[PDB]
Amino acid sequence: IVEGSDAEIGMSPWQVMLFRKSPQELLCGASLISDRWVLTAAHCLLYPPWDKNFTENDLLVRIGKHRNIEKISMLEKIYIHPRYNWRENLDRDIALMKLKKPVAFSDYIHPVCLPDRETAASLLQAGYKGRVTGWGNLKETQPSVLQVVNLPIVERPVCKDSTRIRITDNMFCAGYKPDEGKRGDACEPDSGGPFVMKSPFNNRWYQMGIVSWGEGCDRDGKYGFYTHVFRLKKWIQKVIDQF
Amino acid sequence: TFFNPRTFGSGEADCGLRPLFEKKSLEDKTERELLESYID
Ligand SMILES: *C[C@@](*)(O)[C@H](CCCNC(N)=[NH2+])NC(=O)[C@@H]1CCCN1C(=O)[C@H](N)Cc1ccccc1
Ligand SMILES: *[C@@H]1O[C@H](CO)[C@@H](O)[C@H](O)[C@H]1NC(C)=O
Ligand code: NA
Ligand SMILES: [Zn+2]
Ligand SMILES: [Zn+2]
Ligand SMILES: [Zn+2]
């Protein structure tokens, strides 16, 4: 997270950290959506060019409070979207991981909500701000504490005009425009981390996106791209209700 | 609900409300920015 601020204790209890098992290495962010399911970006688990093609046994996740009541969980199974397009533009950059054993919710561990039809049409509008969190780079090339930054969702036409990469309805972008004054952006390896919004209606936090890609970090005229969670909720259902 | 509780596990009913904030009626230091963004 670039140009972000320190996160308060228990501010993002659904925050998950994805680690390489051997050798231990922080790979990506992720989010807890239930006591046994974790959402993340597909490119965090599958991206051959970066020699990433992980098996469930190659990874571990950490949840909860940052060296005692933290939670280390192994993975039972990994699910990557079958239409994830890593060769082109990262279309459908989404993956699911099932924990080997469900985790107990605590003051520091709780799931984020997934949006329903009415919610994504009331809050997923240009101008509205969401929140992204992560342990990624603080500058284009690391924090000692989880970082956070709130960013406005950007109108599609502006997103498309900001890059030559093909944008799909499965992505949205967010970040401040060059002259809005404020700054902020996610940065590698914040991928897999959640872009959440707090509903003023029921006071619940919903995950609207997943850190997916960007060109550089916090550059003027460019924006961060996120996997559109709601558009892919059907796949999440098939996978969860399938298995 | 959208997910069967048996595959999905615990959570779709207990989600998005933080024990240390919403549950204690405490606002975090920057969530008001999000609220402000909704208000025109
Ligand atoms: C994997 C994540 O850590 C990372 C997130 C980038 C977010 N950046 C900003 N500014 N919010 N994703 C990536 O690094 C992805 C993986 C493939 C390469 N990549 C990029 O973002 C490239 N810099 C651009 C790109 C390459 C291929 C397809 C789409 C975009
Ligand atoms: C992942 O590695 C498995 C071999 O262990 C391979 O069959 C699969 O094609 C890889 N996924 C790719 C490269 O997209
Ligand atoms: Na920018
Ligand atoms: Zn500091
Ligand atoms: Zn190659
Ligand atoms: Zn609870």
Coordinates of C-alpha atoms and ligand atoms in Angstrom, one line a residue:
Chain A
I1 CA 0.0 0.0 0.0
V2 CA 1.5 3.3 -1.1
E3 CA 0.6 6.6 0.7
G4 CA -1.5 4.8 3.2
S5 CA -1.8 4.9 6.9
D6 CA -1.3 2.4 9.7
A7 CA -4.3 0.1 10.5
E8 CA -5.8 0.0 14.0
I9 CA -5.9 -3.2 15.9
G10 CA -8.8 -5.3 14.8
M11 CA -9.7 -2.9 12.0
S12 CA -9.7 -5.5 9.3
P13 CA -10.3 -8.9 11.1
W14 CA -10.9 -10.7 7.7
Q15 CA -7.4 -9.8 6.6
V16 CA -5.5 -12.9 5.5
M17 CA -1.8 -13.2 4.6
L18 CA -0.8 -15.9 2.1
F19 CA 2.7 -17.4 2.7
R20 CA 4.9 -19.7 0.7
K21 CA 5.6 -22.7 2.9
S22 CA 9.2 -23.5 1.8
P23 CA 10.9 -21.2 2.0
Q24 CA 8.6 -19.1 4.1
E25 CA 7.7 -16.0 2.1
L26 CA 4.8 -13.5 2.1
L27 CA 3.2 -13.9 -1.3
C28 CA -0.1 -12.1 -1.3
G29 CA -3.0 -10.8 0.6
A30 CA -6.4 -12.6 0.9
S31 CA -9.7 -12.3 2.8
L32 CA -11.7 -14.5 5.1
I33 CA -15.3 -14.9 3.9
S34 CA -16.3 -17.7 6.3
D35 CA -14.8 -19.9 9.0
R36 CA -13.3 -22.1 6.3
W37 CA -13.2 -20.2 2.9
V38 CA -10.6 -17.6 1.8
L39 CA -10.8 -15.4 -1.3
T40 CA -7.7 -14.2 -3.1
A41 CA -6.5 -13.4 -6.6
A42 CA -5.8 -16.2 -9.0
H43 CA -2.4 -14.8 -10.1
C44 CA -1.3 -15.2 -6.5
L45 CA -1.6 -19.0 -7.0
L46 CA -1.3 -19.4 -10.7
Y47 CA 1.0 -17.3 -12.9
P48 CA 3.5 -19.5 -14.8
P49 CA 5.7 -16.6 -16.0
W50 CA 6.5 -15.9 -12.4
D51 CA 6.9 -19.6 -11.8
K52 CA 3.8 -19.7 -9.6
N53 CA 1.7 -22.9 -9.8
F54 CA 1.2 -23.7 -6.2
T55 CA -0.3 -26.9 -4.8
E56 CA -2.3 -26.7 -1.6
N57 CA 0.6 -28.3 0.3
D58 CA 3.0 -25.5 -0.8
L59 CA 1.1 -22.8 1.1
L60 CA 0.0 -21.5 4.6
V61 CA -2.2 -18.6 5.6
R62 CA -2.0 -16.4 8.6
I63 CA -5.1 -14.8 10.2
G64 CA -5.8 -12.7 13.2
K65 CA -3.5 -10.7 15.4
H66 CA -0.1 -9.7 13.9
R67 CA 2.8 -13.1 17.3
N68 CA 0.8 -15.2 19.7
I69 CA -3.0 -15.4 18.9
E70 CA -2.3 -15.1 15.3
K71 CA -3.7 -18.1 13.4
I72 CA -1.7 -20.3 11.0
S73 CA -3.8 -22.5 8.8
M74 CA -3.0 -25.1 6.2
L75 CA -5.0 -25.4 3.0
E76 CA -7.3 -28.3 2.1
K77 CA -7.9 -27.3 -1.5
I78 CA -7.4 -24.5 -4.0
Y79 CA -9.8 -23.4 -6.7
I80 CA -8.8 -21.1 -9.6
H81 CA -11.4 -19.7 -11.9
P82 CA -11.4 -21.9 -15.0
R83 CA -11.6 -18.8 -17.3
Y84 CA -8.9 -16.9 -15.6
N85 CA -6.9 -15.2 -18.4
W86 CA -3.3 -14.9 -17.3
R87 CA -1.8 -14.8 -20.8
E88 CA -3.7 -11.6 -21.6
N89 CA -5.2 -9.2 -19.1
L90 CA -5.8 -11.2 -15.9
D91 CA -9.5 -11.4 -16.7
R92 CA -11.3 -13.1 -13.7
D93 CA -8.4 -12.8 -11.4
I94 CA -10.1 -14.7 -8.6
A95 CA -9.3 -17.9 -6.5
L96 CA -10.8 -19.7 -3.5
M97 CA -8.9 -21.6 -0.9
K98 CA -10.6 -23.9 1.6
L99 CA -8.9 -24.2 5.0
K100 CA -8.0 -27.6 6.4
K101 CA -9.9 -26.9 9.5
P102 CA -12.4 -24.1 10.1
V103 CA -11.0 -21.2 12.3
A104 CA -12.7 -19.8 15.4
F105 CA -13.9 -16.2 15.1
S106 CA -12.4 -13.8 17.7
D107 CA -12.0 -10.1 18.3
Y108 CA -9.3 -10.3 15.7
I109 CA -10.8 -12.8 13.3
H110 CA -14.1 -12.4 11.5
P111 CA -15.3 -12.8 8.0
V112 CA -16.1 -9.9 5.6
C113 CA -19.5 -10.0 3.8
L114 CA -19.9 -10.7 0.1
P115 CA -22.3 -8.3 -1.7
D116 CA -25.7 -9.2 -3.0
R117 CA -27.6 -7.6 -5.9
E118 CA -29.1 -4.7 -4.1
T119 CA -25.8 -3.9 -2.3
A120 CA -23.5 -3.9 -5.3
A121 CA -26.0 -1.6 -7.2
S122 CA -26.3 0.9 -4.3
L123 CA -22.6 1.1 -3.3
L124 CA -20.7 0.2 -6.5
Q125 CA -20.9 3.6 -8.1
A126 CA -18.2 6.0 -9.3
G127 CA -17.2 8.5 -6.7
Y128 CA -17.9 6.2 -3.8
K129 CA -14.9 5.2 -1.7
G130 CA -13.8 1.8 -0.7
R131 CA -10.9 0.6 1.4
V132 CA -7.9 -1.5 0.5
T133 CA -5.5 -3.1 2.9
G134 CA -2.2 -4.8 2.7
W135 CA 1.5 -5.5 3.6
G136 CA 2.8 -4.7 0.1
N137 CA 5.4 -2.2 -1.0
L138 CA 5.2 1.3 0.5
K139 CA 6.8 2.7 -2.6
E140 CA 7.7 1.5 -6.2
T141 CA 10.9 -0.4 -6.1
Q142 CA 7.5 -2.8 3.3
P143 CA 5.6 -2.0 6.4
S144 CA 6.0 -3.4 10.0
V145 CA 2.1 -3.0 10.4
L146 CA -0.9 -3.6 8.1
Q147 CA -1.5 -0.5 5.9
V148 CA -4.8 1.0 4.8
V149 CA -6.0 3.6 2.3
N150 CA -9.5 4.6 1.2
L151 CA -9.9 5.2 -2.6
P152 CA -12.8 6.3 -4.8
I153 CA -14.1 4.1 -7.5
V154 CA -13.4 5.5 -11.0
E155 CA -15.9 5.7 -13.9
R156 CA -15.2 3.0 -16.5
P157 CA -14.5 5.4 -19.4
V158 CA -11.7 7.0 -17.3
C159 CA -10.3 3.6 -16.3
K160 CA -10.2 2.4 -19.9
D161 CA -8.5 5.6 -21.1
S162 CA -5.8 5.3 -18.5
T163 CA -4.2 2.1 -19.9
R164 CA -3.7 0.2 -23.1
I165 CA -4.5 -3.1 -21.3
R166 CA -8.0 -4.5 -22.2
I167 CA -10.4 -4.0 -19.4
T168 CA -13.4 -6.3 -18.9
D169 CA -16.7 -6.1 -17.0
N170 CA -15.0 -8.3 -14.5
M171 CA -12.7 -5.5 -13.3
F172 CA -13.1 -2.0 -11.9
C173 CA -10.5 0.6 -11.0
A174 CA -10.1 3.0 -8.2
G175 CA -7.8 5.8 -7.1
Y176 CA -7.7 9.6 -7.0
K177 CA -7.5 11.6 -10.2
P178 CA -4.3 13.7 -10.7
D179 CA -6.0 16.8 -9.5
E180 CA -8.3 15.5 -6.8
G181 CA -5.5 16.3 -4.3
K182 CA -5.3 13.0 -2.4
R183 CA -3.2 10.0 -3.4
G184 CA -3.0 6.3 -2.6
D185 CA -2.9 2.9 -4.3
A186 CA -2.2 -0.8 -3.7
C187 CA 1.1 -2.1 -4.9
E188 CA 2.8 -5.5 -5.3
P189 CA 2.3 -7.8 -3.4
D190 CA -1.0 -6.4 -2.2
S191 CA -2.7 -8.7 -4.7
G192 CA -5.4 -10.9 -3.3
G193 CA -6.2 -8.3 -0.7
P194 CA -9.7 -7.0 -0.3
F195 CA -11.2 -3.7 -1.5
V196 CA -14.1 -3.3 1.0
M197 CA -16.9 -0.8 1.5
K198 CA -19.0 -0.1 4.6
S199 CA -22.7 -0.2 4.0
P200 CA -24.3 2.8 5.8
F201 CA -27.5 0.7 5.8
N202 CA -26.7 -2.3 8.0
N203 CA -23.3 -1.1 9.2
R204 CA -21.6 -4.2 7.6
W205 CA -18.4 -4.3 5.6
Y206 CA -18.6 -5.9 2.2
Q207 CA -15.9 -7.0 -0.1
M208 CA -16.5 -5.5 -3.6
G209 CA -13.0 -6.2 -5.1
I210 CA -9.7 -8.0 -5.0
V211 CA -6.4 -6.3 -5.6
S212 CA -5.5 -7.5 -9.2
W213 CA -3.2 -5.3 -11.2
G214 CA -1.9 -1.9 -12.0
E215 CA 1.0 -0.2 -13.9
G216 CA 3.5 1.2 -11.4
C217 CA 2.1 2.3 -8.0
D218 CA 0.3 5.6 -7.2
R219 CA 1.3 7.3 -10.4
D220 CA -0.6 10.3 -11.7
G221 CA -3.3 9.5 -14.3
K222 CA -3.2 5.7 -13.6
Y223 CA -5.5 3.7 -11.3
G224 CA -5.5 0.4 -9.5
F225 CA -7.5 -2.5 -11.0
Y226 CA -9.6 -4.9 -8.9
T227 CA -11.5 -8.1 -9.6
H228 CA -15.2 -7.3 -9.6
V229 CA -16.3 -9.7 -6.9
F230 CA -20.0 -9.4 -7.4
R231 CA -19.8 -10.2 -11.1
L232 CA -18.1 -13.5 -10.2
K233 CA -20.2 -14.4 -7.2
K234 CA -21.9 -17.2 -9.2
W235 CA -18.6 -19.0 -9.6
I236 CA -17.9 -18.6 -5.9
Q237 CA -21.3 -20.2 -5.3
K238 CA -20.7 -23.1 -7.7
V239 CA -17.3 -23.9 -6.1
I240 CA -18.6 -23.6 -2.5
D241 CA -22.0 -25.2 -3.0
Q242 CA -20.4 -27.7 -5.3
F243 CA -17.8 -29.2 -3.0
Chain B
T1 CA -28.7 -16.7 2.5
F2 CA -26.8 -17.5 -0.7
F3 CA -24.6 -20.2 0.6
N4 CA -25.5 -23.4 2.2
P5 CA -24.2 -23.2 5.8
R6 CA -22.9 -26.8 5.5
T7 CA -20.4 -26.1 2.7
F8 CA -19.7 -22.6 3.4
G9 CA -19.2 -23.0 7.1
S10 CA -20.0 -20.3 9.8
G11 CA -20.2 -16.7 8.6
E12 CA -22.7 -15.5 6.1
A13 CA -25.0 -14.3 8.9
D14 CA -22.1 -13.2 11.2
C15 CA -20.1 -11.1 8.6
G16 CA -18.7 -7.5 8.2
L17 CA -19.3 -6.5 11.8
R18 CA -16.0 -6.0 13.7
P19 CA -15.9 -7.1 17.4
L20 CA -13.6 -4.1 18.2
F21 CA -15.6 -1.5 16.3
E22 CA -19.2 -2.0 15.1
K23 CA -19.9 -4.4 17.9
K24 CA -18.6 -2.0 20.6
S25 CA -20.1 1.0 18.8
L26 CA -16.7 2.5 18.0
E27 CA -15.8 4.2 14.7
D28 CA -12.4 3.5 13.3
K29 CA -10.2 6.6 12.5
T30 CA -11.0 6.8 8.8
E31 CA -14.3 5.1 8.0
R32 CA -16.1 8.5 8.0
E33 CA -14.3 9.2 4.8
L34 CA -16.2 6.4 3.2
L35 CA -19.5 7.6 4.6
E36 CA -18.7 11.1 3.4
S37 CA -18.2 9.7 -0.1
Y38 CA -21.8 8.4 -0.3
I39 CA -23.3 11.7 0.7
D40 CA -23.4 13.3 -2.7
Ligands
LIG1 C1 0.0 -9.8 -8.0 C2 -0.2 -8.4 -7.2 O1 0.6 -8.4 -6.3 C3 -0.2 -7.3 -8.3 C4 -1.1 -6.2 -7.9 C5 -0.8 -4.9 -8.7 C6 -1.6 -3.8 -8.2 N1 -1.0 -2.5 -8.6 C7 -1.6 -1.3 -8.4 N2 -1.0 -0.2 -8.9 N3 -2.7 -1.2 -7.7 N4 -0.5 -7.8 -9.7 C8 0.4 -7.8 -10.6 O2 1.6 -7.5 -10.5 C9 -0.1 -8.3 -12.0 C10 0.3 -9.7 -12.3 C11 0.7 -9.8 -13.7 C12 1.5 -8.5 -13.9 N5 0.7 -7.6 -13.1 C13 0.6 -6.2 -13.2 O3 -0.2 -5.5 -12.5 C14 1.4 -5.6 -14.3 N6 2.2 -4.4 -13.8 C15 0.5 -5.1 -15.4 C16 -0.4 -6.2 -16.1 C17 0.3 -7.3 -16.6 C18 -0.5 -8.4 -17.2 C19 -1.9 -8.3 -17.2 C20 -2.5 -7.1 -16.7 C21 -1.8 -6.1 -16.1
LIG2 C1 0.3 -26.4 -12.8 O1 1.4 -27.4 -12.5 C2 0.6 -28.7 -13.0 C3 1.9 -29.9 -12.8 O2 2.2 -30.2 -11.6 C4 0.4 -28.6 -14.5 O3 -0.4 -29.9 -15.1 C5 -0.6 -27.5 -14.7 O4 -0.7 -27.4 -16.4 C6 0.1 -26.2 -14.2 N1 -0.9 -25.2 -14.5 C7 -0.6 -24.3 -15.7 C8 0.8 -24.2 -16.1 O5 -1.4 -23.4 -16.1
NA3 NA -3.0 7.3 -9.6
ZN4 ZN 4.5 5.1 11.0
ZN5 ZN 7.0 -18.2 -20.0
ZN6 ZN -19.0 -13.2 15.6

